[PDB]
Design a protein around this ligand. Structure first.
Ligand SMILES: *[C@@H]1O[C@H](CO)[C@@H](O[C@@H]2O[C@H](CO)[C@@H](O)[C@H](O)[C@H]2NC(C)=O)[C@H](O)[C@H]1NC(C)=O
Ligand SMILES: *[C@@H]1O[C@H](CO)[C@@H](O[C@@H]2O[C@H](CO)[C@@H](O)[C@H](O)[C@H]2NC(C)=O)[C@H](O)[C@H]1NC(C)=O
Ligand SMILES: *[C@@H]1O[C@H](CO)[C@@H](O[C@@H]2O[C@H](CO)[C@@H](O)[C@H](O)[C@H]2NC(C)=O)[C@H](O)[C@H]1NC(C)=O
Ligand SMILES: C[C@@H](NCCCc1cccc(C(F)(F)F)c1)c1cccc2ccccc12
Ligand SMILES: C[C@@H](NCCCc1cccc(C(F)(F)F)c1)c1cccc2ccccc12
Ligand SMILES: N[C@@H](Cc1c[nH]c2ccccc12)C(=O)O
Ligand SMILES: N[C@@H](Cc1c[nH]c2ccccc12)C(=O)O
Ligand SMILES: *[C@@H]1O[C@H](CO)[C@@H](O)[C@H](O)[C@H]1NC(C)=O
Ligand SMILES: *[C@@H]1O[C@H](CO)[C@@H](O)[C@H](O)[C@H]1NC(C)=O
Ligand SMILES: *[C@@H]1O[C@H](CO)[C@@H](O)[C@H](O)[C@H]1NC(C)=O
Ligand SMILES: *[C@@H]1O[C@H](CO)[C@@H](O)[C@H](O)[C@H]1NC(C)=O
Ligand SMILES: *[C@@H]1O[C@H](CO)[C@@H](O)[C@H](O)[C@H]1NC(C)=O
Ligand SMILES: *[C@@H]1O[C@H](CO)[C@@H](O)[C@H](O)[C@H]1NC(C)=O
Ligand SMILES: *[C@@H]1O[C@H](CO)[C@@H](O)[C@H](O)[C@H]1NC(C)=O
Ligand SMILES: *[C@@H]1O[C@H](CO)[C@@H](O)[C@H](O)[C@H]1NC(C)=O
Ligand SMILES: *[C@@H]1O[C@H](CO)[C@@H](O)[C@H](O)[C@H]1NC(C)=O
Ligand SMILES: [Ca+2]
Ligand SMILES: [Ca+2]
Ligand SMILES: [Ca+2]
Ligand SMILES: [Ca+2]
Lengths: 811, 818
């Protein structure tokens, strides 16, 4: 036979089942000093007993109806695995015992029944160990809870089927949930078995595609010792990540949760996989301050109508075929059953004690057990109603229901398609898998009772296009059980505008510093990895949020220095017009006729042009003022020097009038120099940007310096010749000491235009035009004063008629 | 009973063996009235047959020996697994058939008992065998399974191995990668219990050492076309040149064939131990892809009679080996009687080159040898146990006539023996050994063209962390032909004037280089932050190091300051000479006529005016700049007052009062200016970045205004009262010269107005100095240079009447009108 505690019943066709009635086995490390005994199972599991009852209720309901398998009863043989590979293998060796006597040729009870199909285990490692042995004899195994991706491999597992989705959609959904709430800094914890490792590897692969940085990654187990648990707890406690993604079940997560609760570590955001998101080992009222507000996945519910009334009929004396009912009665009512702790009577009421057996709201894994039994029954009904010539075997032949074999049932299970009680269609794919939606739940705290309440906050729709599968209603979520604000789980705070992301070495790419943008660059947005250089005509604001236009610099009108220069120029023009009016008003008087009368008019006109030529420097330096600011002053002032130079004594030793030829031939050189310079290479405007970054100047580009050198040197040469021929005869008393005044005027010229040299070599912006204008007006006021003011003071001032006569002029 | 072909011999105690005599099975499916028949194994493995011969040789050598297990013979039942789980479980069901009948109470009545099994090769196979053998506590010693998941003794109760596990090898891969300074790799692992935990341990160790991983893929022996195309696309879309592979030969052969048929060259392959010596991959047709591979190997051992036993195999004389017949058929390509030609029993096995006798080193064969001798020494410990000293309950001993499998497992846990090379064998608490690694490189034989595995280093697991690796870099050919180490970084290194910059969406190993701005620098290679060096320093034009900003001031050892100091010294040693020749000629006539005591005070004030020029040279400090300008102000107002007062005044000594008042009225100003807003030194850094200007901040400007203004006023009035007497001939026409001097003053302090406003804050001090040393000379000359001549070049002209009316003007003799 096999294990002695079982639920079995005879029939024409026998099914097999494997359920965890205990949570684990007793902790005993054997030292092998004596022959090893059988291990004992410890903690009773009411949920697994309900799953076993779901299988038995399905079998009895199928045998009741006359439409699903007429005149042919099903039987069963069900064992207990205790979530352990070894006990499951001791059961599976009894399943395959008749097949294996044939294959190993041992020929001896000869009344051993044969098992057609087995309802599978809950854990993936247990399912792999059972599947390796059931695939040898082609016995089909349908699992209700194993969801590892490794069991989709049909090269290794030839006869495995399941009614639960595999876990790739769940890890993708976890990555989508993390992307929805805009986190990037997470930690991961998985169980060290075939369920946790592929799930957490698939989560890691999906997480690096979405730029989510994982801080830590640790493995746990039910049989971890103490120092591994303090290593994992110290890894959790050292990290700044708040969101932790866990692939585990209840038994593998319980020691870690107990040690975290003992140290009272709060503030973490847990992401549960489906195995522990509804686990009564973890959803405890005294753990809540650690595990409140846990967000998890759940399967879709289903309706089994007469099931609760079947569940309330269990009894130790009336369940002859069920052998697990006795310990159920003992563990519910805390008594001892004395077959024929206080002593039981067998009369107690199941509703009086609250256990997970009938305290439930939805049926989720129990529905998978129900559907597995109906899948096997509709495969056998497909065999029963097969028509000759239309079968699934050679030449369209049909199997015999009276001598059916397991490989033919597996063949009909691969081509299976049927409608359940809820109206949906059930079909397995080529990998032997089934697909379904997910519900998304949150852990709350009951106000009526003080216990944990699972509230649905969203769904995950697996038939939708990628990136459109998640729905979450955020207004129904209490973070950490009580808070209404979404928590912060990034590595570092976001950089603002005006700054830039900087690397921290040895750390992942989600962790950065915020460095301010440099002097000439902005940053427009938040979380900028670079600073953008501002355009040529604009310079960055001090805030560095955005940049504004530069400041243009030029000496201008409507400026409190240019107004002063303009008023001085107008005063000079008014003075020259006054002197011209005085000379015209008395032109038959001897003082003006003793001087050359026809020649002073050109002198006064040249002084008028010299005053008016200084206005070209003031203002915005356009193109046609840079071309005429120097030649106008050059020509006008050389005309002035020539008109001075003719009227000196002893400089006319050698046409109709013979004094204007000297003036014409001395002005003609400046005229031709200006014409050839302005023809070969004219000056231009120039926007100067290389002196200061913040401001730009508007200046005049000269074009050449050879022609400007000639145009200054010729004027200095004429000034030197006139100064020589005036200083040589300075003692002559004629014309009211005129040669002395010519000497003083040329001296003032040379002092001003030597003393204004070092302004040019040092100043660079507005001040150059200022010192040019001040120099021009200073030189021309000096020349006008020194030539004419003594003559004016004699003509009309208080010595009016006394010193005006011709006999006084040369005395 | 069980599988049909087997190697089988009987004795007192029966062992068991699982070896991969084939490489795999053939493919089929589709139960369309196939009552499913047994599947066929396809490709013959000569290395696995050598491994099977090692076990038989060890058993026969023990049975010949009188020192180990006397009067007790060992036996064997050995099966073929074909590297698949299902054949191994078919054989293991035959191992445990007797213990099974005791359990389920379910016969042949002649089933022998197996007490130990020499284990499987693949970790996926050994896991499935160990799950069923641990039910009955039958020990299982494996020779090649190296997955870390088999170290878990809560699940695998009776598992031991004579090979080390793969934690050290996965750490050693990251050590080798960190040795050659690469940080940008890709990983490939098989999809089973050997590849996935090894590559996960490597990923953890690589992320600990700041090594970035670009891709990570999984392959299998049963991958279809599209998965291989996807992996090849992933490989040749990447710039990483180093690929780390955890796989065996059969799981890697399809991928290698697809890479070979495309010319994908230049990759650097890092081999794990299972495929670094595989004959399926190390072939001459693949050398342009897999040449230059660097891989791991175990330590070799000696079996001193194994080759002559290997050359003794015959199909008709090996009556206890059922696998010899297919060996003979597959070697000489013939058919044995009981189209390919007929065999004779007369061939020499030294002709055909197969992996059977063509090896250099025994590595896994030595592990099979040790796995047999471990079981033999545990049974020897059972046989030589003294009562009172046993490992069981009351110090009792096991019975050798009626031994049980759990008792052999108990002695296997407490084993410590010494092997044939004088080293100690013992298992730890997880049932493991530890051992060194050899590091090999793939080369090309110049004599034949086959692939040679050349040792280039070792990995020592008994050393401490960080000192376990020795690599001789001179012996490596890098793709089989190259002598330079490849480049396998994501991006190039940044230079001395640059820092790193983030590429958004890419890992930390992929960056940009951005130059440091003005004022910062960098000096190392990978900077990631520019540095601002401290105050009064500015960066170079290279942004490598920063140099010191130079300070700018009128210095003493600068030659311009030397020239100005020599003009000052000439001025003082001119006025001192004037003072000396005045003191010698006091009572002479043309000296007593100018109020001789005012001349001495005038020269004292003028010497102070010369000496006030030296306060403007040097680095400006607090005590110097506060006394720069008031010294010149007081000295010059004393000069102007002494020049002004010596013209004759009838009413309003009782004359010096004036010379008091006219200076006192400025002294007070100076006082107030130093007691409400004194000037100070000031470093002005904002004009030029690379130049530090040191100058003065002059406090309140208004005060200075006042100062200057007063001076000027008291000059002007003097000028006027000199000019009014300009045509009055007395004192060699003194008045005129006074006027001239005053004019000079004015001109010198007017024409220096633009330059003072031009270089202000940069080089104004020099300007000032020049102005002073022009004005002072003016005074001196124009006042007291005319008389000197008549003092000491024309004697007997210094008479009284000349002071009244002078015949010869001279005026220096006009310098003799040179
Ligand atoms: C935490 O980090 C994430 C990712 O780094 C930030 O989310 C990004 O925000 C910007 C601006 O709104 C979007 O353009 C990106 O698409 C977001 N990323 C994702 C993946 O959605 C998030 O803003 C950060 N949270 C806080 C509080 O700073
Ligand atoms: C593992 O490898 C190390 C490194 O070669 C071995 O240590 C050396 O052994 C040789 C030969 O006995 C000595 O000459 C050296 O001095 C040893 N040390 C070093 C640092 O090279 C070690 O013996 C090997 N272990 C085993 C068990 O073989
Ligand atoms: C590839 O990258 C690595 C690490 O980013 C560089 O290794 C550094 O090399 C320098 C000099 O060779 C050492 O000073 C550093 O200590 C190394 N860093 C580490 C972490 O080991 C390597 O130089 C790069 N290779 C090339 C060619 O640029
Ligand atoms: C208005 C005045 N401009 C002098 C520019 C000097 C300069 C500035 C920059 C570069 C150069 C250089 F190219 F010559 F070096 C020279 C000017 C104009 C015309 C005649 C003049 C005759 C006598 C005195 C002044 C004259
Ligand atoms: C040494 C000198 N320091 C300030 C010169 C300013 C200035 C620069 C250029 C021109 C002028 C002036 F024309 F206005 F004088 C003044 C100084 C100190 C104290 C008294 C002074 C009296 C007269 C002159 C200089 C005086
Ligand atoms: N999916 C889990 C089994 C499982 C699902 N739901 C559960 C609820 C309780 C316990 C286990 C489970 C596995 O693969 O092993
Ligand atoms: N270590 C491999 C087995 C192995 C080691 N060396 C080998 C050489 C050839 C083939 C297989 C192997 C495993 O765990 O599966
Ligand atoms: C965690 O932090 C503690 C204290 O800073 C430190 O000693 C320890 O090394 C860190 N890491 C782990 C794994 O405990
Ligand atoms: C645990 O933490 C909570 C905070 O939520 C605190 O109120 C309580 O006192 C703590 N208990 C212990 C035992 O530290
Ligand atoms: C299953 O049967 C229904 C009934 O019409 C059909 O619509 C559906 O396509 C079938 N499914 C498969 C996979 O054949
Ligand atoms: C999955 O969910 C969507 C909407 O949430 C629903 O329309 C669909 O029918 C669900 N799938 C199944 C199989 O019920
Ligand atoms: C820019 O700086 C000013 C300070 O004057 C501040 O008022 C303003 O808010 C800043 N602009 C921003 C932050 O956009
Ligand atoms: C590889 O690169 C090509 C071209 O760059 C691209 O079209 C293709 O999608 C890539 N494939 C993968 C698997 O990345
Ligand atoms: C593959 O590349 C090599 C160069 O390394 C070349 O010699 C060879 O011809 C290529 N293979 C084929 C089939 O062309
Ligand atoms: C094994 O035995 C030798 C002596 O026989 C001893 O030196 C050595 O320490 C032993 N090893 C262990 C692990 O006990
Ligand atoms: C440093 O600058 C000098 C000249 O300024 C140049 O010659 C030299 O090459 C630079 N050094 C570098 C670029 O490493
Ligand atoms: Ca029925
Ligand atoms: Ca790091
Ligand atoms: Ca012997
Ligand atoms: Ca990316």
């Amino acid at each position: 036979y096999g294990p002695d505690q079982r639920a079995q019943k005879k029939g024409d066709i026998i099914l097999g089942g494997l359920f965890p009635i205990h949570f684990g086995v007793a902790a005993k490390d054997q030292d092998l000093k004596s022959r090893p005994e059988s291990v004992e199972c410890i903690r009773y599991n009411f949920r697994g007993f309900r799953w076993l009852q779901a299988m038995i209720f399905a079998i009895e309901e199928i045998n009741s109806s006359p439409a699903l398998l007429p005149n042919l009863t099903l039987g069963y043989r069900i064992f207990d695995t205790c979530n352990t590979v070894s006990k499951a293998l001791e059961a599976t060796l009894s399943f395959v015992a008749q097949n294996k006597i044939d294959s190993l040729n041992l020929d001896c009870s000869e009344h051993i029944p044969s098992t057609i199909a087995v309802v599978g285990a809950t854990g993936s490692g247990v399912s792999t160990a059972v599947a390796n042995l059931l695939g040898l004899f082609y016995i089909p195994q349908v699992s209700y809870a194993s969801s590892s991706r490794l069991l989709s491999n049909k090269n290794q597992f030839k006869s495995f089927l399941r009614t639960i989705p595999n876990d790739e959609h769940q890890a993708t959904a976890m990555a989508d949930i993390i992307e929805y709430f805009r986190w990037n800094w997470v930690g991961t914890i998985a169980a060290d078995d075939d369920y946790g490792r592929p799930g957490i590897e698939k989560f890691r692969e999906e997480a690096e595609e979405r730029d989510i940085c994982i801080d830590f990654s640790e493995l746990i187990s039910q049989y971890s010792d103490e120092e591994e648990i303090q290593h994992v707890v110290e890894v959790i406690q050292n990290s700044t990540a708040k969101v932790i993604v866990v692939f585990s079940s209840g038994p593998d997560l319980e020691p870690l949760i107990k040690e975290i609760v003992r140290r009272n570590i709060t503030g973490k955001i847990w992401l549960a996989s489906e195995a522990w998101a509804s686990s009564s080992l973890i959803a405890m009222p005294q753990y809540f301050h650690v595990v409140g507000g846990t967000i998890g996945f759940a399967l879709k519910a289903g309706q089994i109508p007469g099931f609760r009334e079947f569940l309330k009929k269990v009894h130790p004396r009336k369940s002859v075929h069920n052998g697990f009912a006795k310990e159920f009665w003992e563990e519910t009512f805390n008594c001892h059953l004395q077959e024929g702790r206080p002593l039981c009577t067998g009369d107690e009421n199941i509703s009086s004690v609250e256990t997970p057996y009938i305290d439930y709201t939805h049926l989720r894994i129990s529905y998978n057990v129900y559907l597995a039994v109906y899948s096997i029954a509709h495969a056998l009904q497909d065999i029963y109603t097969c028509l000759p010539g239309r079968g699934l075997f050679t030449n369209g032949s049909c199997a015999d229901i009276k001598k059916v074999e397991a490989w033919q049932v597996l063949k009909h299970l691969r081509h299976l398609n049927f409608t359940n009680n809820m109206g949906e269609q059930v079909t397995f794919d080529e990998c032997g898998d089934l697909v379904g939606n997910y519900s998304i739940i949150n852990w709350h705290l009951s106000p009526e009772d003080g216990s944990i309440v699972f509230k649905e906050v969203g769904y995950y729709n697996v038939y939708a296009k990628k990136g459109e599968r998640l729905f979450i209603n955020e207004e129904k979520i209490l973070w950490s059980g009580f808070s209404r604000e979404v928590p912060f789980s990034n590595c570092s705070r976001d950089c603002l505008a005006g700054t830039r992301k900087g690397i921290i070495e040895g750390e992942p790419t989600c962790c950065f510093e915020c460095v301010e943008c440099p002097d000439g660059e902005y940053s427009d947005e938040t979380d900028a990895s670079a600073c953008n250089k501002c355009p040529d005509d604009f310079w960055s604001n001090e805030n560095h949020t955005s940049c504004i236009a530069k400041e243009i610099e030029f000496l201008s009108w409507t400026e409190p220095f240019g107004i002063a220069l303009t008023l001085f120029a107008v005063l000079g023009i008014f003075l020259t017009a006054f002197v011209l009016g005085v000379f015209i008003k008395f032109r038959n008087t001897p003082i003006v006729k003793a001087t050359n009368r026809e020649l002073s008019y050109l002198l006064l006109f040249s002084l008028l042009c010299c005053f008016s030529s200084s206005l070209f420097f003031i203002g915005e330096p356009q193109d046609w003022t840079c071309r005429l600011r120097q030649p106008a002053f050059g020509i006008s002032f050389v005309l002035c020097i020539s008109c001075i130079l003719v009227k000196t004594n002893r400089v006319l030793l050698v046409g109709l009038n013979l004094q204007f030829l000297l003036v014409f031939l001395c002005t003609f050189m400046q005229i031709v120099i200006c014409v050839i310079w302005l023809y070969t290479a004219p000056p231009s405007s120039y926007r100067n940007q290389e002196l200061e970054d913040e401001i730009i100047f508007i200046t005049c580009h000269e074009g050449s310096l050879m022609a400007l050198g000639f145009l200054i040197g010729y004027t200095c040469l004429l000034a030197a010749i006139c100064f020589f021929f005036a200083f040589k005869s300075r003692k002559l008393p004629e014309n009211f000491n005129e040669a002395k005044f010519i000497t003083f005027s040329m001296l003032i010229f040379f002092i001003v235009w030597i003393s204004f040299i070092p302004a040019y070599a040092s100043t660079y912006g507005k001040f150059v035009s200022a010192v040019e204008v001040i120099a021009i007006l200073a030189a021309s006021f000096g020349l006008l004063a020194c030539i004419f003011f003594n003559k004016i003071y004699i003509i009309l001032f208080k010595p009016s008629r006394n010193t005006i006569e011709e006999v006084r002029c040369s005395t």
